[PDB]
Design a protein around this ligand. Sequence first.
Ligand SMILES: Nc1nc2c(ncn2[C@@H]2O[C@H](COP(=O)(O)OP(=O)(O)OP(=O)(O)O)[C@@H](O)[C@H]2O)c(=O)[nH]1
Ligand SMILES: [Mg+2]
Lengths: 144, 189, 1040
Amino acid sequence: KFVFGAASKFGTGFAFGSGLSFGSGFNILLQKQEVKSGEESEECIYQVNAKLYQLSNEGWKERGVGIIKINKSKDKTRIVMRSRGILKVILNIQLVKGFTVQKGFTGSLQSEKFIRLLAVDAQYAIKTKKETTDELYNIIVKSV
Amino acid sequence: VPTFKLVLVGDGGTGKTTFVKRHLTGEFEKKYIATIGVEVHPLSFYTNFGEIKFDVWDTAGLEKFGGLRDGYYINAQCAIIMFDVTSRITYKNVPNWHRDLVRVCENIPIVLCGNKVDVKERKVKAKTITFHRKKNLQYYDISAKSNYNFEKPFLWLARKLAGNPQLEFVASPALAPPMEQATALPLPD
Amino acid sequence: GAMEGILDFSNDLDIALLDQVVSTFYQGSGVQQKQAQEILTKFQDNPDAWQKADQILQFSTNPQSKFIALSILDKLITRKWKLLPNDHRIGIRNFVVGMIISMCQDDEVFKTQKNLINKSDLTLVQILKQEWPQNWPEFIPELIGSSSSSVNVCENNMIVLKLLSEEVFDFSAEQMTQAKALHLKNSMSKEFEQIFKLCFQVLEQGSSSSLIVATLESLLRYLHWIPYRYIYETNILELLSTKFMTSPDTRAITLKCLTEVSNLKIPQDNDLIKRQTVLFFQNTLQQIATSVMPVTADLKATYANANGNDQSFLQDLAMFLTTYLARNRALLESDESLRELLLNAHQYLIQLSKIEERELFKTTLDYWHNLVADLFYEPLKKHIYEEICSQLRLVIIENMVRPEEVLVVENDEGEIVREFVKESDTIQLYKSEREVLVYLTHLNVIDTEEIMISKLARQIDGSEWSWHNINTLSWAIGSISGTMSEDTEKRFVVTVIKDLLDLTVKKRGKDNKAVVASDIMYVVGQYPRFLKAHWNFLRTVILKLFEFMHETHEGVQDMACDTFIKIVQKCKYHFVIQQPRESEPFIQTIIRDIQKTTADLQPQQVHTFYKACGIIISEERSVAERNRLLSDLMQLPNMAWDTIVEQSTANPTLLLDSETVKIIANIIKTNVAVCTSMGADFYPQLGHIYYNMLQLYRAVSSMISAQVAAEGLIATKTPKVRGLRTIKKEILKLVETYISKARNLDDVVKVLVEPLLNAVLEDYMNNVPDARDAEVLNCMTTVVEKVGHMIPQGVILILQSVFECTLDMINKDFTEYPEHRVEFYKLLKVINEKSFAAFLELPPAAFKLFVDAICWAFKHNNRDVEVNGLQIALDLVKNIERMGNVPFANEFHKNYFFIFVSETFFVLTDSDHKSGFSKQALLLMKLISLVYDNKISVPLYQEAEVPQGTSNQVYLSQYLANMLSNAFPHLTSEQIASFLSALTKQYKDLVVFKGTLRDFLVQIKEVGGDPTDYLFAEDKENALMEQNRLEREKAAKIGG
Ligand SMILES: Nc1nc2c(ncn2[C@@H]2O[C@H](COP(=O)(O)OP(=O)(O)OP(=O)(O)O)[C@@H](O)[C@H]2O)c(=O)[nH]1
Ligand SMILES: [Mg+2]
């Protein structure tokens, strides 16, 4: 460690290979094109470009930016989100009965662009333009 | 499903671990915690040539935390070399990292990444960054902070490994799924 | 667990244990892989692990274990070799050679353990850097001798020899002392005859692909340094340009050889050598056309296919053609029989320039810049390349990338979006493309116009319509602004604009609109000359921008604001005069409509609009009319500001409503925007708000103080307080922006400054650490930079109010309050520069705090802080030296000189501050000169310390020898004596002094450096005067 007042402690004061054979020295002279399935035999109702955060205890961490999707399963509803570019799944949630989705986030100026949420492995925060954050809310709310 | 070992090398502070963490968790690590030796992390995505799996070997760039050094490169099938466009010395050191790497891995695809391009006062200018040309390395200006080009090293590397520039990312399969104290916490960004 | 058993050295090394720990690490995963990695590091780092490496290398069955053993030995060889008795040095060297030969003489090992053989040859090389030639004079002949035993060993020897050349010529700088480097270079050059004999032999009479390739790999490194005659006076240029270009396997490496051949030291007035440079180029080009592809090949399609090493081959072709042609093209330019060679090679470059690979494209573009600038300056060579140039117009036009001013782009779902991030690579390329194109245009303005008008007709008829094609054409058109005469340009611009508005009508929907809107914007903003001659057009353009500011596309809005600025920055004259057929300056019309024009803009865009209006106003050169335009522009923010001041004064609790905080921040940032283009002329508007603004600052400050009492530290984290602190940061930016551009400094000092300090300094000093804003420091910095000279006592007051309390936030560690930390040292730096007298007035306890804060700055790894620390030390030192023989100066030197010396030496020398190297060296050099230039009037020692009458020079070297002795006890006293002897003689020569620092930095890492290494520079100067005396005698002989 370094200590603020202290002078730097800089200049203070106060038989290899023998038994062995070499030893001697010079004397020894597919990927193939596939199809992946989205895993979607559902229909995409609403989609918007979004930013996602997660909190598991301090504090909120970024998680991904991408298209969040609400999918209707040609019957059940779920939320599907993917990271832009690399396109990994960063959010995948069945819309079950007794589901809590709150508008707003206060500790952020843009908080009217925000929405919060609770899910199986902690909580998530989505961000969207205000008009689209309400759309996402009502479309989510409508379900189950 | 094959797995490809990716070694990640370069001077300390250049954003290697921050870059892996970005890809792994989505988070942006603000602190500099120097890596000690190496840290290994699996990392995958899907393409139209199926799933691509990297074993990312995130090495220490500080000489005192060097560990097995070039012993980390044995059997790498690809690599990323990272410097910090904010720091001249890190680009001046790019040939040393490249020298140690190719002595161990003769014929592997290697991406040169100039990171932190989001910083206003850039110090290593575009016209200085020539090293990759004679060495047949791909070069990208990236930012782990803004996500600029941060998927590109992986796409290029996967295209080399599959031997098919037709390769593209596709959507990973989405399979069946299984407060008040927070609202006023600050947000990282 | 059990893996750590290998770290127990009281027992015999169990190799099968090692092997299993090794495999667990390389082939394992998760926690076991990670613990094995820890055990392995500690094993390799045990200072006695080398003793175990012979058994490991002889008996281990795991190639990776043997690799680790070689690293152990690498560490021993590089740093402790000279501590070995002969018995060990000879034994290790033999053992290593023996092992190499055994691996080579076993086909399966030589086939499958390349990485391990290569690590061993590198280890051999590290032994040659210690042992060769002086203690192994026979090595090179023996190694060359061994080549005949087999093709495997011969091949391997090429590797050894390539390795050796690397370490000696390519990677020796800063890895060894300058003198060790010279010696090894001299040693290798004296044995190169025999090396070349071997390498040439294999090149003429060899069959093995793998062996020819390794030889060529070595040749590539030899060409970095060998004498020209080995290339030109043997047949090798022929064998490279002909047979080795012919065979598929050798072709990549040969091309890289011929690329460096291009770069060799050439006799300029040797006409046989000219003719040889021509011939190899001729041979290589002929072999490409015969055996690889013709000049009509579609290299774009070929590269995109990416078969085999085609992409590398094609990068290397580009590199060869551009290297050779930028050095040698004039060779080909006058001899008619060379004309076709010249043009085929450039035709090959044209085809490479269509490849879709950005970096490769940059490589060819750099060359094209070199070519076309040369023709701009020599226009008589213009005709030779007419048809190269005209194809290149097409290539460049078709591949323009997006200018930084275009903010509309395509996302991944086929949509047109506002750009997410600035792209610095794209911006630089656009700029490189523009210069080339500006050049091409000057070469032929009429062909460029014709091509661009034609391409646009294909945009209108839809034959070539796409976003991508209209965009690159628009960017290309904007890019050549300035190339035409005003009269040509006028006709050109009218056609473009009319065609673009023609596209505006036919191509509908949000995506097509935003694309074309961005192209029109980009073009009009690039042609100010034309807008300045055509008022009704300018006027119409501005009104079209106003329309665009209502588009729902946000990228179109953002761009319309920025285009407005770009146009007014050039055209502002035209908004302040009354044009013919108008009743008023257009600025008044703009200002009147502001509410309506900006109604759909976001704050940030509203600000940019006020800023543009600010640029126009400062064009009005009558003060009274100017102050009236400003007043008028500021009508809506002043209206909002008077209301919110009245209201929040009556009811301070409004300052807690986040909606009140947004209102205020944006009023203030509107003022910041106008101040940014107005500068000095902003003062009337600043005065208009200044008094109520600083009251606002004071009121906000006690709001903060009400929430800190009621809720403790965590108060600082709540959106109430963060809102309050934003009003304060924004007020401070407004004040910084003005003062930084002020011209009337009397007004700053007599009207602005005292109420500022008054409102700001005690509030910051007395607040809790966590509620102090770093912007206070930044604002003070500007106050000091700008007017500090005029206010000695104000600076003292600033220093006093921020120094100790800010220092207390940042002296515990290196990471707390990073913004405060950065601002603090910038502030210290400016005070130390503009008003040193403020430090002269610190009591001595606080002046010591000043020094300590400095030495703390140099121990940071943060380069922002670090850089300023060293700069401050240098400026302090200079400021002390400026005072002359004087009590404060003398005390400072008796108190601090050696603290600066040894603190500088510490960071210079510990391996954690390598970016600081050059500025440490400057600092060390200045301190040294203070003594050796007899600039310190007084003894640096106390009477107790030294013989009566010892000089400062003698005291300085004893002090440093002993300090250095304690830090690096592995050094002999002769090394330390010679280092300091060199330094104290080199202190006036930055380059020579740094080399010696570099030399020392190598030698502290190893045992037993040569103390004569520090006579490099001296030896060099003497070797040079013998060369000049021998040159002089030759010239005497040559003529009597
Ligand atoms: N501004 C900016 N900072 C970044 C970026 N990426 C990384 N950093 C910062 O750089 C610092 C160093 O990060 P690391 O990822 O830990 O460095 P490393 O390359 O892993 O270094 P070693 O592990 O020592 O070799 C951290 O403070 C990062 O947050 C970027 O894209 N932009
Ligand atoms: Mg790391």
